Amino acid sequence: AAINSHRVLKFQNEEVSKNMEKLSSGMRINRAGDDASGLAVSEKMRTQVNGLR
């Protein structure tokens, strides 16, 4: 059978993709999928940042 390397290959292709998602946006969190609560908090912070201005 293909050895675990086909796990590694697909999984690492996915880790490469996720790494790019973060780097282009400048963020740990681009989606709720990176951190749903970090996001929910930042959305609250956004109303505070924009709300305050």
Binding site: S17, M20, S24, S25, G26
Partner: protein, 53 residues
């Protein structure tokens, strides 16, 4: 002449109103530019790497 002084005070204050409503602080908007330009550049680079996947 009294009336003119009254009108002049309202004038200066009304002009402050237009500036306060419309005129931005160039320093902070410039900061925003710098962040956003970096994020554009990061975008370009990560798509180049995403293409490799």
């Amino acid at each position: 002449e009294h009336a003119a002084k009254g009108l002049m005070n309202a004038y200066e204050n009304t002009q402050a109103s237009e500036s306060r409503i419309r005129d931005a602080d160039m320093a902070e908007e410039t900061v925003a530019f710098t962040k956003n330009q970096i994020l554009v550049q990061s975008g370009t680079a990560m798509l180049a790497q995403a293409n490799v996947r």
